Amino acid sequence: PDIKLFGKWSTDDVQINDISLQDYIAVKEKYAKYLPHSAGRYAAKRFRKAQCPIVERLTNSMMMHGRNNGKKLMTVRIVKHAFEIIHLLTGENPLQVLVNAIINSGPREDSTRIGRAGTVRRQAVDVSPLRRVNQAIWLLCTGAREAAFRNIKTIAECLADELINAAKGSSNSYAIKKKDELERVAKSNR
Amino acid sequence: RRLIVVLEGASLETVKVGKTYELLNCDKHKSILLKNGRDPGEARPDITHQSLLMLMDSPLNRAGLLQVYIHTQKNVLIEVNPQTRIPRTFDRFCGLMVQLLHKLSVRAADGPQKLLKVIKNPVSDHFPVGCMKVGTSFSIPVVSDVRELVPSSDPIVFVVGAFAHGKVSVEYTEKMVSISNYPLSAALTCAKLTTAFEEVWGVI
Amino acid sequence: RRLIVVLEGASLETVKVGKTYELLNCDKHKSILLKNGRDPGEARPDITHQSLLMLMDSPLNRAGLLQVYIHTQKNVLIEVNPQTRIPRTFDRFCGLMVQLLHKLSVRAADGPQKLLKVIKNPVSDHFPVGCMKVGTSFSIPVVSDVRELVPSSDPIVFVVGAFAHGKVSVEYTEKMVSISNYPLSAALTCAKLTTAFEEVWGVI
Amino acid sequence: QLFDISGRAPLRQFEGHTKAVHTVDFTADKYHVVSGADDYTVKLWDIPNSKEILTFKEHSDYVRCGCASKLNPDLFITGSYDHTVKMFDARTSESVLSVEHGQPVESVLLFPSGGLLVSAGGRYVKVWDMLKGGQLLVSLKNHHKTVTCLCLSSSGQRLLSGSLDRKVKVYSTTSYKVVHSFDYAASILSLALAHEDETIVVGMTNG
Amino acid sequence: QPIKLARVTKVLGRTGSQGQCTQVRVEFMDDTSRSIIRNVKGPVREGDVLTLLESEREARRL
Amino acid sequence: DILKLFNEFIQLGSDVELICRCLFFLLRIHFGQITSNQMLVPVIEKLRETTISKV
RNA sequence: AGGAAUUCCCAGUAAGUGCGGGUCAUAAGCUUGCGUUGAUUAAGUCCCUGCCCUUUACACACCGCCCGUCGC
Numbered sequence: 001p002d003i004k005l006f007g008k009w010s011t012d013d014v015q016i017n018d019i020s021l022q023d024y025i026a027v028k029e030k031y032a033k034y035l036p037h038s039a040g041r042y043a044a045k046r047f048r049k050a051q052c053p054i055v056e057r058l059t060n061s062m063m064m065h066g067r068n069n070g071k072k073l074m075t076v077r078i079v080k081h082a083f084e085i086i087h088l089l090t091g092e093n094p095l096q097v098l099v100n101a102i103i104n105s106g107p108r109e110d111s112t113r114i115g116r117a118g119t120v121r122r123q124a125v126d127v128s129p130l131r132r133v134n135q136a137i138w139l140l141c142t143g144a145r146e147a148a149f150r151n152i153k154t155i156a157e158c159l160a161d162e163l164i165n166a167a168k169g170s171s172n173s174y175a176i177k178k179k180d181e182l183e184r185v186a187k188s189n190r
Numbered sequence: 191r192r193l194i195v196v197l198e199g200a201s202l203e204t205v206k207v208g209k210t211y212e213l214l215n216c217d218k219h220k221s222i223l224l225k226n227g228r229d230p231g232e233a234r235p236d237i238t239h240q241s242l243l244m245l246m247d248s249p250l251n252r253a254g255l256l257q258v259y260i261h262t263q264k265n266v267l268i269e270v271n272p273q274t275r276i277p278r279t280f281d282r283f284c285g286l287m288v289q290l291l292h293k294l295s296v297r298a299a300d301g302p303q304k305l306l307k308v309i310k311n312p313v314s315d316h317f318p319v320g321c322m323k324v325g326t327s328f329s330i331p332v333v334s335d336v337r338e339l340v341p342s343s344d345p346i347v348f349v350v351g352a353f354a355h356g357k358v359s360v361e362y363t364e365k366m367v368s369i370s371n372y373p374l375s376a377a378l379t380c381a382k383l384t385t386a387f388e389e390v391w392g393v394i
Numbered sequence: 395r396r397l398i399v400v401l402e403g404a405s406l407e408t409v410k411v412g413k414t415y416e417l418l419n420c421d422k423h424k425s426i427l428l429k430n431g432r433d434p435g436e437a438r439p440d441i442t443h444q445s446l447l448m449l450m451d452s453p454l455n456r457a458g459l460l461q462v463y464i465h466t467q468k469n470v471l472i473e474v475n476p477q478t479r480i481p482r483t484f485d486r487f488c489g490l491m492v493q494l495l496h497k498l499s500v501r502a503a504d505g506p507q508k509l510l511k512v513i514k515n516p517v518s519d520h521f522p523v524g525c526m527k528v529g530t531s532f533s534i535p536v537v538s539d540v541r542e543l544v545p546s547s548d549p550i551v552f553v554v555g556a557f558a559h560g561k562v563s564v565e566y567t568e569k570m571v572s573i574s575n576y577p578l579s580a581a582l583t584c585a586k587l588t589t590a591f592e593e594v595w596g597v598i
Numbered sequence: 599q600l601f602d603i604s605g606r607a608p609l610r611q612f613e614g615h616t617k618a619v620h621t622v623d624f625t626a627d628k629y630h631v632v633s634g635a636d637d638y639t640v641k642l643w644d645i646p647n648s649k650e651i652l653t654f655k656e657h658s659d660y661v662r663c664g665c666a667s668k669l670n671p672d673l674f675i676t677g678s679y680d681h682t683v684k685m686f687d688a689r690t691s692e693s694v695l696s697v698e699h700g701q702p703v704e705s706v707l708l709f710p711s712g713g714l715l716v717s718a719g720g721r722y723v724k725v726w727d728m729l730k731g732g733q734l735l736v737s738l739k740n741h742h743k744t745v746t747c748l749c750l751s752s753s754g755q756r757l758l759s760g761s762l763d764r765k766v767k768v769y770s771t772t773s774y775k776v777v778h779s780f781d782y783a784a785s786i787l788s789l790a791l792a793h794e795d796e797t798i799v800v801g802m803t804n805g
Numbered sequence: 806q807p808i809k810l811a812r813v814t815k816v817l818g819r820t821g822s823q824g825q826c827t828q829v830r831v832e833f834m835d836d837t838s839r840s841i842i843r844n845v846k847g848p849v850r851e852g853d854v855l856t857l858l859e860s861e862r863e864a865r866r867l
Numbered sequence: 868d869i870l871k872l873f874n875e876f877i878q879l880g881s882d883v884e885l886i887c888r889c890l891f892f893l894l895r896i897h898f899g900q901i902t903s904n905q906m907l908v909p910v911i912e913k914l915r916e917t918t919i920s921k922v
Numbered sequence: 923a924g925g926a927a928u929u930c931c932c933a934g935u936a937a938g939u940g941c942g943g944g945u946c947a948u949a950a951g952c953u954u955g956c957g958u959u960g961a962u963u964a965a966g967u968c969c970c971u972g973c974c975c976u977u978u979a980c981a982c983a984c985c986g987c988c989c990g991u992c993g994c
């Protein structure tokens with residue numbers, strides 16, 4: 001049998017174009033699940049949350065933002081609606097869209113600060129792949145939340161357009177702006 | 191597209207003499223400044239006052255493309271509504287801050303909208319994300335043309351110090367520029383930053 | 395070639411309260427001003443304050459390329475030296491004005507050279523030969539670009555109203571122009587006027 | 599405005615046109631739209647990108663009727679009240695074919711197989727072939743008022759035309775002769791056919 | 806300057822002085838058999854792959 | 868440079884063990900890079916003769 | 923939708939929700955149990971603020987003397 005997310009999105013066609021992030025995005029055949037709700041212990045040990053599927057991580061990180069915490073089913077349906085809207089608008093596999101968005105949104109180098117009372121200075125430093133994934137997911141969720149606030153537009157459409165723009169690589173998205181400015185500051189502090 | 195102006199190091203603080211509360215001025219409060227070993231010549235609300243008059247009456251604010259932030263010396267951030275009408279004369283101006291600094295907000299008399307509001311630090315959180323952040327100072331040897339630095343369709347942040355002496359130094363700015371070969375006041379600095387912007391953005 | 399600006403309708407006068415001599419300020423003198431039924435709000439000395447600060451601090455003036463004249467409502471004509479420093483604080487500004495009207499002039503603190511002195515009416519006599527006069531106001535339907543009105547090597551006289559309400563109208567002005575479609579302050583009109591003439595004459 | 603059939607607010611809004619817009623349709627691929635408005639211009643938009651791909655300005659009156667070919671996304675036809683039906687098609691910056699009609703063109707329809715274009719103006723209904731450009735194969739009038747709309751049945755042979763005279767005419771494409779008539783109470787502004795001939799819907803002058 | 810890829814061979818320790826970043830030894834995925842020392846922000850273990858915009862800068866230099 | 872300086876230290880015969888322990892650690896960690904560079908060929912030839920001879 | 927400053931917090935933990943009891947003290951707009959839903963980041967250094975100790979079981983291997991003052 002073939003395991004398809006929500007019964008209709010396959011995972012075999014999904015491919016990752018970044019060799020560095022191959023080991024930290026769990027979307028392939030072993031990590032394929034029917035629903036993003038598995039009730040595992042992925043925060044028990046260091047580096048174990050790399051085994052949690054990326055859709056479940058997106059569901060968890062969408063619960064923290066702009067919501068009373070502990071409501072997971074609402075977030076699952078929000079993710080389902082966002083995937084449906086993405087498929088309707090773009091016509092391709094939403095899993096590939098999400099993977100491309102996470103690949104594009106992740107910063108490559110950051111700036112470590114040495115700070116005193118008077119002034120702060122920086123040095124450009126490398127970023128580990130796990131922090132790349134964490135910041136990508138966090139930026140996408142925060143951008144969707146900020147776009148959805150005080151607007152006649154439900155969170156699902158804002159999340160869908162955020163993933164669409166990030167996967168396209170357009171600068172109209174929040175995460176791309178944040179990533180570009182972080183790399184620009186890191187370049188300036190070399 | 192918009193211009194963000196942040197007034198760094200504004201000398202806005204409240205002191206009490208007798209039974210009355212009024213903002214701390216170098217001249218009216220000369221005796222109490224000498225008390226407690228405070229150096230005279232930093233209580234200058236006028237620098238913020240003259241600088242504010244230039245921004246709020248500028249054509250860019252008239253067209254609705256100017257937003258002004260004030261960061262005082264006591265690390266208090268104030269948001270300036272473009273629809274606010276600032277006092278032109280010095281005395282009633284100080285009443286606004288005494289109204290603002292204790293009550294933390296100022297409501298419009300003829301409108302439900304707030305006009306002045308104190309918000310959470312740091313100021314870097316409230317800028318549109320991805321905006322360019324540039325400061326103004328004489329310490330730069332190279333004189334830069336303001337028109338060349340203006341973005342076509344993006345917001346940009348310009349920081350002007352509100353002190354007669356000292357150097358602007360905040361964490362979020364990425365470059366330091368000078369735009370004249372002569373030392374000029376903060377108020378005129380407000381003028382030359384804004385007056386270049388309308389002509390690029392087609393406001394005449 | 396040199397820019398000459400005359401402040402017409404300036405509200406500068408000294409009144410007697412108690413035994414001391416004080417400048418006639420609107421806010422300070424509400425009790426006195428209401429008596430005799432002359433209109434409150436007309437006495438607006440501060441308009442002269444920031445106007446001088448913008449003009450004197452402009453790079454053109456420290457270049458030696460600016461002349462400022464004051465023609466008050468009480469028909470007093472005042473010269474100002476380019477080396478004069480105008481106080482930033484308003485009451486120190488009102489301090490110097492008081493000694494002008496009574497002592498007719500003021501010497502520098504470190505030299506006999508004249509910084510302020512009241513001269514004889516009219517202002518037209520002291521104008522240099524071959525100079526044409528232009529008036530500035532908002533009411534003109536057509537807006538004039540200031541870059542077009544600058545002469546290459548001819549001195550120039552402009553009039554800016556330092557009064558509260560009304561319109562400038564003097565005999566020696568030959569033409570009347572507008573610089574923007576918005577109601578502007580005299581300080582900003584002085585601000586824009588000094589800004590445009592700066593780049594044309596090679597001052598940066 | 600793009601709308602979801604289960605939502606409440608538009609998913610995408612396009613701001614390019616300046617005056618009222620009256621015709622809009624998809625393409626052969628389901629991700630671009632072609633629109634025509636009263637500002638004499640016809641614009642092609644991309645749905646996911648949320649921007650206008652291309653524009654055309656080659657008409658002199660109100661543009662209120664348009665159709666897009668199902669076979670090819672590139673090929674589509676635009677008609678107007680300027681008496682000209684210009685086909686904006688292929689991948690270029692100008693009309694490749696144009697057609698002249700003697701009355702303002704109320705509606706245009708593209709017959710799927712064989713490249714036949716049917717145009718309605720006034721009483722006249724005119725059929726044009728694309729094997730030879732601008733060839734009027736047959737012009738027919740069976741109405742005593744202006745012809746409003748033209749529809750195609752599920753079968754290729756049957757064709758329907760509705761007008762302002764409470765009367766709908768059914769023709770065979772092979773013979774180009776009327777084979778049936780329908781009579782109604784008010785002038786038929788809209789005529790719609792379901793799968794096969796299951797449901798016939800006619801929308802009138804009144805509510 | 807083309808984008809470079811590196812593999813983490815040995816994890817040295819936490820700087821302390823330079824924030825809390827980790828010094829790691831990285832060897833380039835090219836068949837040049839080079840190895841340098843870099844500063845990494847965030848959790849990193851042996852076997853990780855890093856993306857370098859600049860392959861010339863060294864962590865410990867005069 | 869340090870490989871050249873180490874060659875002088877072994878030849879003098881003073882503090883051989885500390886230099887040898889230091890020398891063998893550099894060779895292993897940079898084994899891949901040292902082979903590629905042709906400029907280092909003369910240095911290793913001098914190091915090869917000196918190291919075994921002194922030990 | 924609550925400034926300046928300041929307090930607390932690492933896994934069924936933070937946060938939301940309901941349902942009981944009043945138990946020889948404490949508890950009434952309070953106090954304590956029970957269950958349901960359940961997260962983001964971190965698994966390491968002495969850089970700041972500090973705390974606790976030390977500087978006299980001879981396998982192999984490694985290593986090879988902390989300093990100063992005043993009293994008797």
Ligand SMILES: Nc1ncnc2c1ncn2[C@@H]1O[C@H](CSCC[C@H](N)C(=O)O)[C@@H](O)[C@H]1O
Pocket residue numbers: 326327328329350351352353354355356357358367368369370371372373374375376379
């Ligand atoms: N030529 C110039 N270009 C840009 N900013 C200027 C300027 N001259 C003065 N300023 C700004 O105006 C403010 C007050 S002028 C204060 C002088 C101070 N030595 C200084 O230059 O920093 C300062 O904060 C300064 O940043």
Ligand SMILES: Nc1ncnc2c1ncn2[C@@H]1O[C@H](CSCC[C@H](N)C(=O)O)[C@@H](O)[C@H]1O
Pocket residue numbers: 530531532533554555556557558559560561562571572573574575576577578579580583
């Ligand atoms: N748009 C404008 N262009 C040129 N001068 C202006 C101006 N707006 C105001 N001024 C000058 O500024 C002074 C004060 S404004 C005085 C009020 C008058 N209704 C007016 O709008 O001008 C006047 O003396 C006037 O000459």
Ligand SMILES: [Mg+2]
Pocket residue numbers: none
């Ligand atoms: Mg709160």
Ligand SMILES: [Mg+2]
Pocket residue numbers: none
């Ligand atoms: Mg409870």
